[PDB]
Amino acid sequence: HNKDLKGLYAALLVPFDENGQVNEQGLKQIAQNAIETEELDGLYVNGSSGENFLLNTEQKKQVFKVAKEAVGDKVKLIAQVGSLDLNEAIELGKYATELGYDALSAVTPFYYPFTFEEIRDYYFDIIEATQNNMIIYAIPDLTGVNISIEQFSELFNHEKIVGVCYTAPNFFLLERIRKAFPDKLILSGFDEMLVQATISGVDGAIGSTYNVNGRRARKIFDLARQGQIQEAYQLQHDSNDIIETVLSMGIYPTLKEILRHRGIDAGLPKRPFKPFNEAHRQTLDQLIAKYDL
Amino acid sequence: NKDLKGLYAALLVPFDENGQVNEQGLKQIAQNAIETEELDGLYVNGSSGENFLLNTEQKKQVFKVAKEAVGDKVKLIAQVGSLDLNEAIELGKYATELGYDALSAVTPFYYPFTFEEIRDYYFDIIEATQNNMIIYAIPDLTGVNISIEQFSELFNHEKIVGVCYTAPNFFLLERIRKAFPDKLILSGFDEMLVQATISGVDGAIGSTYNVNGRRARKIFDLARQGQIQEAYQLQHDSNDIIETVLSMGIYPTLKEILRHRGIDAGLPKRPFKPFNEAHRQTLDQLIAKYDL
Amino acid sequence: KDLKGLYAALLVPFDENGQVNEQGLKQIAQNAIETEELDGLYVNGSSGENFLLNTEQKKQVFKVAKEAVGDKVKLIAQVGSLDLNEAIELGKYATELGYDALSAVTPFYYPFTFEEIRDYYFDIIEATQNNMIIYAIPDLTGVNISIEQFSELFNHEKIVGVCYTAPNFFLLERIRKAFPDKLILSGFDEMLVQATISGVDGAIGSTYNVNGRRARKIFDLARQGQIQEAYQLQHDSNDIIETVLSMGIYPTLKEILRHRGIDAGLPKRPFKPFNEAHRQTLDQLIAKYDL
Amino acid sequence: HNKDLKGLYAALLVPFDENGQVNEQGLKQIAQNAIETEELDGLYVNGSSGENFLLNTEQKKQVFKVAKEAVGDKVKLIAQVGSLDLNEAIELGKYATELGYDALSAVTPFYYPFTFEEIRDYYFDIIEATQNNMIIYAIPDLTGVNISIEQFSELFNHEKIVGVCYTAPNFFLLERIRKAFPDKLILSGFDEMLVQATISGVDGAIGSTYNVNGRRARKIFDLARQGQIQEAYQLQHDSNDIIETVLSMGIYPTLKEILRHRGIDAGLPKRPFKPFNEAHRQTLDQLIAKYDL
């Protein structure tokens, strides 16, 4: 049953106004873009890419509400509810669950040097008070937390921890996890290594660049699994041009600018993130023309 | 207009089973710091207060309780930094209106913010609050490191009055002391208080000063009176204590030490786990050896 | 020759005094070619306990390895050292023996600047007149090479490729795209399948000393779009790799070789010998995978 | 009557010709400068600052012999013999002991991920083969290896592991080591932190900058020990101006430029180290003038 949530997901980006308030109308357009135009399977809501950790609780609910209203019932929805405030995490978990989100996910607790048992019981406490399926959100590069195979075994021993959004750049640890946990869901989080993740047996992927590059991403995934490896990899080359450029210019503002070119009310990033820098505008215009973004 | 020199307690916070502030116990913790531990001031809503686990209303609640529990002679610094800048500004306005002497803010963490993004977070808070600001630098929790050149650009701001410096680098500390002779430097590593003091710091903020403030003042005073042999010996003893408390879970364990004095020390906030009782004996041995 | 293909990072057997066992070394060399069916030997790399050796022992390893195998066998000589004089002496020595290319570890320990790293490669090249492969092993050296820095290095016509051990598939893909005509040999045995689909030209590995047949099928199947089969042999191969790493890779690999009648000797101290408390577990692995 | 090993040591620099060969006459001058001009207690020979890890065995012996023959019989001499090749370490350990060196030291084995028991028996094997006293050479910034308090206790259990050259930036660990081992020799290795090391109870120090700045170093050490801490710290301010400058310029070639300025044939660095960059000359001359180097 744990493979229900397989597929490609947009890590939903969020447009803000000048005071860091959610632009609800552009958000509806970003959600719709990712399903109708980028033809993806679902939305990963209030993750790192949605600037989620800059938000207050009310804004997070506001994003959850608008994202679900914006899509049809066939669209898969994962609610990222992890927070350093466990009371908040539970509140948001109950909220997203009552709305009908298919699964929750939660960042590994960060900032403080939490012990593994403290990290473990954080997942267990959210599960118990929300009774929803849970996906571990592992982004070592943001959290400084690393999860070993032994720790994954303890976590995966809970029947409601159904899988992981996996972001460690380690394809040895990825393969071991894949072999050790054949029935759990693994969605990879490194857009720039989608093809390698695909051939390592991932069940899908969650990505910020799929908001603008979701159709090449689906081909990478499909071609690689049909053993069209050369063709899959050439698409990874193209995708990585996109990813590398968008990374050099500031990822979330730049992605939202590509969506603006599509006529989306892409608003602004939430301070302390700065708005897209115009010194980049022409290189970005070149990229958009080159890859038809 | 107080100078902000001296020794501060990084205020610990007692919670109930639900993660709610025990207001009664917190008032006790605050007064212990001032009355028993003879400290110059309180550093409020910092990492040791379990601040990053709290909601906005709880942070305000801690600020108000702390301020009400202390006299006017007491120096107060309000840590208002948050990944949500609107919240930081909200909290900055609130603590300022309560009469806190300065704000401080943690360097923005999690996301790989550029330095210019970090700088304008400090500038934006100052300019909505008009209070003096202290850079809260804890590379070990934030993963952010500030260079001499970057302190130079920040200290150029009239309202950035100094730094809470919890980096372990004594070359960098010396360079900063020399480069910025009229800025405030408070050290944040309790276990290197004696090296900090002889490196010319203006004072210190620490969580162990909640239980070991008498020795900490002696290290501070003795090292400056050049009675360094004796100041370092107290550092050996302090560091015995810091070592033990760290191995036991520092915040729960410090509040367990405070329980022993009849303080309503409550719980840590989940996901922090409470004091493990397997440690109870060794802790009793420590409280006993060091008269804690 | 073209230098594409699968190479054994040649292991070296020692006596109790850390002297090279030349008969054992011959048998290891021949085992890699005849039994493991590999294309070449990568000689005096990290896996050969090279950085524990003296200069005359390194010369000894180069001579014995070349003499052990036939003319069709591809031979790469790692001559990099913190001692550039030694690096040059060794590069000349291996070039004179007829090694196909030289390779050289990024200078480490001292915080060399890039320009100092770059001219170390250029200085070895000038003195030897042989083709050079960058030996990039950040986990042992602590040195990382940027795409920018690879570009500067690859401008040199005699810097012909890279033995690539960084566990970073974004950087690997960048390099492959930027340098379609350079030779990329991957260094991580446990990620051969990901490396192969990222378009590497071959691989250098210590575990290929005992698992070269499976490695070849990983390589070949992945390139034929037989991607599930290739991945399955990666699972199998990674069981082996994980086990051997947990026991102490060099002495354990040489212990698997000793099970074939090879005089695999001892590791060089400060490396300790294979620990007997691992023997049953290792025997079970050998049985499981027919090693 | 064997020597008390307390005091201030120059980390001996080595001058090279255009082919990376030792200049013995310059080397003798550098050695005598450290004792007679800089008034230091001892030489630490064939450490990192002597560019030792760039040398062949015959060169290392050249250096041991010349440094020994340059100085009087009261001059303290510590021989760094550690190597990735244990056979070489043993050989040099014997060579240096036969020369009359007061102690050996040995870098923690590096490059390969040796277990700690492997590291330990590396020291115990050198000791057994040489029967001289041994100093742990801990330079984590170069070796990438860290020794914990518990690891120190096990090494220090050996009667012939007599102390540590502690070139490691951690003052909490330094204090623990000091507290646990009142019977062991601690020489600190960070010049820029000599005042902090002094008040933390070290027995002395080994430094490359003491080749040009040993007179200030001694006042820092002596003053701080006598409680005159503000004067000591002011000299740390001054000394760190020199150290920061010399680090910015390329430390070994620059220190050797400073010595060339006093009439010493300080030669060249050994490649891959590049020579002093002339673009730094004016800044260097300004430093020499300011502090009378």
Residue numbers in the entry:
A (entry chain B), D (entry chain A): 1 to 293
B (entry chain C): 2 to 293
C (entry chain D): 3 to 293
What did the article's authors report about this structure?
We then characterise the resulting enzyme activity, analyse the pH-dependency of catalysis and use X-ray crystallography to investigate the structural basis of the changes brought about by modifying the enzyme.
A mutant nanA gene encoding the K165C S. aureus NAL was created using site-directed mutagenesis and DNA sequencing confirmed the presence of the mutation. Calculation of side-chain solvent accessibility for the K165C variant showed that the cysteine is inaccessible explaining the need to unfold the protein prior to chemical modification.
